[PDB]
Design a protein around this ligand. Structure first.
Ligand SMILES: *[C@@H]1O[C@H](CO)[C@@H](O[C@@H]2O[C@H](CO)[C@@H](O[C@@H]3O[C@H](CO)[C@@H](O)[C@H](O)[C@@H]3O)[C@H](O)[C@H]2NC(C)=O)[C@H](O)[C@H]1NC(C)=O
Ligand SMILES: CC(C)CCC[C@@H](C)[C@H]1CC[C@H]2[C@@H]3[C@H](O)C=C4C[C@@H](O)CC[C@]4(C)[C@H]3CC[C@]12C
Ligand SMILES: CCCCCCCC/C=C/CCCCCCCC(=O)OC[C@@H](O)COP(=O)(O)O
Ligand SMILES: [Ca+2]
Ligand SMILES: [Ca+2]
Ligand SMILES: [Zn+2]
Length: 778
């Protein structure tokens, strides 16, 4: 019978054009039939059976049933067997390893149930089985990490879609809870019907990837009035559908503990209550799965999207204290700041004046302004038209707003800060057939889970920003095996081919062991030369006229010499490299804005004789004088420091060209600044990979087991306006700037189209785990 919801409640073939709908999203579209809340959302007698309800006569108006025939109809309360058939709650069963998916007949695959909780800070898991018995046993039985790193901004909507796509917000388009698309000339918001339009959403989410490859998904979404218990009973009821109508992947999301976390903060005593109610819902799901004889078949992912931080209104910075006029600008306020012009036609609006008026203007300033290209590359922002040119990175525990008027304490917790902040770290737990038994894994970013979930359903994942294989150690059996990217350009090994008289670069001068993990593979068409020296090895690009990488090893005992005062302006030609593909000092001395540095520092030479190799023209790179304060401190103080703390370090350094701020290696046509009157391109960033042995008892060049690595992508900027303390000695701000721009080896690989750690004696999945490690310093 058409026109009403009986026989169709939460049907997985929902559609507005035909009839009124009865699915779990009819509320959000305001299109439910008149009998939806009467038939599909029954709430009589609650969600728990009792001793007296055992074997009752079927009353169809009850919320859930405790009759005898409910197991066949597939709509018992989740505690039916526990209270009526003497069974035990799943949380009380001992932890028994699942060596193989024990599934009842009919299941092509272990079902995947995604359980998402908003605002579940990683600190919450320290409450134990006293508050959350079901969650802690999922964590101890299955696979878990100390925390999971979200994406920036650490907000629900960008993170929930990132979890479903594996892409950064810059690529899937959901760059914030609120955003303005200038092409649409429209505003995206949390509340409202604008979010329902498909134009805002890029990438390919998990449910679309499953649908396209013949794996039914159903409906991932739940209208907010549908209670959590009804959402669980709906999922369990779907699990009893016939074979070719039963979805394989399911998703539950909960708005707690985000709501209570905002009202009371992450450490409020009121936080205990919602975390009990969340574990109750987890208990209902696992009780129902055991009741369905699926507790040893289903895969369950308990995941969060963002943490929570203590934020009060008394800690809100106001732009009206900084800018002469705030009426000409529109600001996205809160734990992050995005500033654009309020008027289409306003030529009196200039970003350089606003950025300057916001740059180190007050002591104890709790925000920092950035052009989006100058944000730390680990954030992977910028590359989207919905991302404004002016971004304010807000200090943790603080807010920023335009005026005090747009501000009228209502809240005690908030989120959205840098994704490396401790309070923003969230949780991940994997329990089920394919997940490992009682295993802890290192922290990882949520961009990597999309590959795992498709692997759990046999789906080929759409292109994403996870490094497929870096999470292979999460599963019991992996169908996917990573492929080392094959080398595109083979290197040249040039000997001495020229005489020093062949060179007229206008340059003066008054006169294995260093490649520990194999050479980097060049993954694009170019021409470069391998150059061996006593102290360092480098792959010199003949196209960019500078090395793409330079590798050298500093022992724990290595001494730091100094350039003699008569050799400080010494640059020598490389007789192995043609003068046609060499840099020249006349370019640098005629460029009044640019100086030069060295990828291998002459301060770390093993001998004055070998020091002349450091002054080769093939070891030099264009560097602004203000950046040379940062580069020279890193090479002369910090590398020796790192080699002392870590029993030697292997340093791989090189330039990065990303003028279009898309995170990918630029080709020749995208470089927008050269050395004046030259063909020497100006790098936008400089990277370094500092590798040691995880077992510090062994030196870096004699390491047997896993490695310890840390990387940075220092922005090559002509001023130090980013560091407000740059007036003082380099021991008071440089290390802080580098900690801000920490990076994964993976991010350097994207920005240079290179591949590191190819001959390591470790398994490639373990290496893929290393290349995704982010040293957060927190
Ligand atoms: C994160 O992953 C996404 C998706 O893999 C990456 O974005 C993709 O970037 C590539 C390279 O720029 C784009 O490919 C190109 O497509 C154009 C047509 O638009 C055409 O010239 C070629 O087919 C070329 O391959 C691709 O369209 C784009 N896709 C999406 C969905 O964004 C992104 O670069 C990754 N981020 C990082 C930091 O690696
Ligand atoms: C409970 C409501 C208030 C929350 C609104 C839910 C909203 C986030 C969901 C509901 C419908 C979803 C879209 C739909 O599933 C189809 C796809 C196709 C895919 O290629 C891109 C994403 C998209 C458009 C979904 C986006 C998220 C939606 C709007
Ligand atoms: C497949 C992995 C994802 C698991 C399934 C989640 C659904 C897929 C994600 C879709 C992107 C849009 C989110 C869906 C609705 C979000 C429901 C929700 O809970 O929103 C609450 C959020 O406003 C409040 O948090 P904040 O304002 O950021 O503090
Ligand atoms: Ca680029
Ligand atoms: Ca300064
Ligand atoms: Zn949330």
């Amino acid at each position: 019978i058409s026109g009403s919801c009986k026989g169709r409640c939460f049907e997985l073939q929902e559609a507005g054009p035909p009839d009124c709908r009865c699915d779990n999203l009819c509320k959000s579209y305001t299109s439910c039939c008149h009998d939806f809340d009467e038939l599909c959302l029954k709430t009589a007698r609650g969600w728990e059976c009792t001793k007296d309800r055992c074997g009752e006569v079927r009353n169809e108006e009850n919320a859930c049933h405790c009759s005898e025939d409910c197991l066949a109809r597939g709509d018992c309360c989740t505690n039916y067997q526990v209270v009526c058939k003497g069974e035990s709650h799943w949380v009380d069963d001992d932890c028994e390893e699942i060596k193989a998916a024990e599934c009842p007949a009919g299941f092509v695959r272990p079902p995947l149930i995604i359980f998402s909780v908003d605002g579940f800070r990683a600190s919450y898991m320290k409450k134990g089985s006293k508050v959350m018995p079901n969650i802690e046993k999922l964590r101890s039985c299955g696979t878990h990490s100390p925390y999971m790193r979200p994406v920036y901004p650490t907000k629900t909507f960008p993170n929930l879609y990132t979890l479903a796509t594996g892409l950064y917000p810059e690529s899937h388009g959901i760059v914030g809870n609120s955003m303005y698309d200038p092409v649409f000339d429209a505003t995206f918001h949390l509340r409202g019907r604008e979010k329902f339009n498909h134009r805002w959403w890029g990438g390919q989410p998990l449910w679309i990837t499953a649908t396209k490859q013949g794996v039914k998904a159903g409906t991932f979404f739940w209208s907010v009035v549908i209670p959590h218990e009804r959402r669980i009973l709906t999922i369990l009821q779907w699990l009893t559908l016939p074979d070719h109508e039963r979805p394989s992947v399911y998703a539950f999301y909960s708005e707690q503990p985000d709501f209570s976390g905002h009202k009371y903060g992450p450490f409020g005593p009121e936080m205990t209550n919602p975390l009990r109610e969340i574990d109750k819902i987890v208990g209902q799901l696992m009780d129902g799965l055991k009741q369905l004889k699926l507790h040893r078949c289903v895969n369950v992912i308990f995941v969060g999207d963002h943490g929570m931080e203590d934020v009060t209104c008394d800690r809100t910075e106001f732009l009206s204290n900084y800018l002469t006029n705030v009426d000409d600008i529109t600001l996205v306020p809160g734990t992050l700041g995005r500033i654009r012009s309020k008027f289409s036609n306003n030529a009196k609006y200039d970003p350089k004046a606003i950025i300057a008026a916001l740059t180190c203007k007050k002591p104890d300033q709790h925000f920092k302004p950035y052009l989006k290209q100058h944000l730390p590359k680990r954030l992977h922002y910028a590359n989207n038209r919905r991302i404004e040119d002016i971004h304010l990175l807000v200090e943790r525990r603080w807010h920023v707003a335009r005026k005090p008027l747009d501000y009228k304490c209502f809240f005690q917790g908030d989120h959205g800060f840098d994704n490396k902040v401790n309070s923003m770290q969230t949780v991940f737990v994997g329990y089920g057939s394919t997940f490992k038994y009682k295993t802890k894994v290192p922290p990882f970013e949520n961009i990597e889970l999309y590959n795992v979930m498709c692997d759990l359903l046999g789906l080929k994942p759409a292109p994403n920003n996870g490094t497929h294989g870096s999470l292979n150690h999460l599963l019991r059996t992996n169908t996917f095996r990573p492929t080392m990217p094959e080398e595109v350009t083979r290197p040249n090994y040039p000997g001495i081919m020229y005489l020093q008289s062949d060179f007229d670069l206008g340059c003066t001068c008054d006169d294995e062991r260093h490649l520990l993990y194999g050479r980097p593979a060049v993954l694009y068409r170019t021409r470069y030369d391998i150059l061996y020296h006593t102290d360092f090895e480098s792959g010199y690009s003949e196209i960019f006229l500078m090395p793409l990488w330079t590798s050298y090893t500093v022992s724990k005992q290595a001494e730091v010499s100094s350039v003699p005062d008569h050799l400080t302006s010494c640059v020598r030609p490389d007789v192995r490299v043609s003068p046609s593909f060499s840099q020249n000092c006349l370019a640098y001395k005629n460029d009044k804005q640019m100086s030069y540095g060295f990828l291998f520092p002459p301060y770390l030479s093993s001998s004055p004789e070998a020091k002349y190799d450091a002054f080769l023209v093939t070891n030099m790179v264009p560097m602004y004088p203000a950046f040379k304060r940062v580069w020279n401190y890193f090479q002369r103080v910090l590398v020796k420091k790192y080699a002392s703390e870590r029993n030697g370090v292997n340093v791989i350094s090189g330039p990065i060209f990303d003028y279009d701020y898309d995170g990918l290696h630029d080709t020749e046509d995208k470089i927008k600044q050269y050395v004046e009157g030259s063909s020497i391109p100006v790098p936008t960033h400089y990277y370094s990979i500092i590798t040691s042995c995880l077992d510090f008892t062994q030196p870096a060049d004699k390491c047997d087991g896993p490695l310890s690595v840390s990387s940075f992508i220092l922005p090559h900027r002509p001023d130090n306006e980013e560091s407000c303390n740059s007036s003082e000695d380099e021991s008071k701000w440089v290390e802080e700037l580098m900690k801000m721009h920490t990076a994964r080896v993976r991010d350097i690989e994207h920005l240079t189209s290179l591949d590191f750690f190819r001959k390591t004696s470790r398994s490639y999945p373990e290496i893929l785990t290393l290349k995704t490690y982010l040293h957060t310093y927190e």
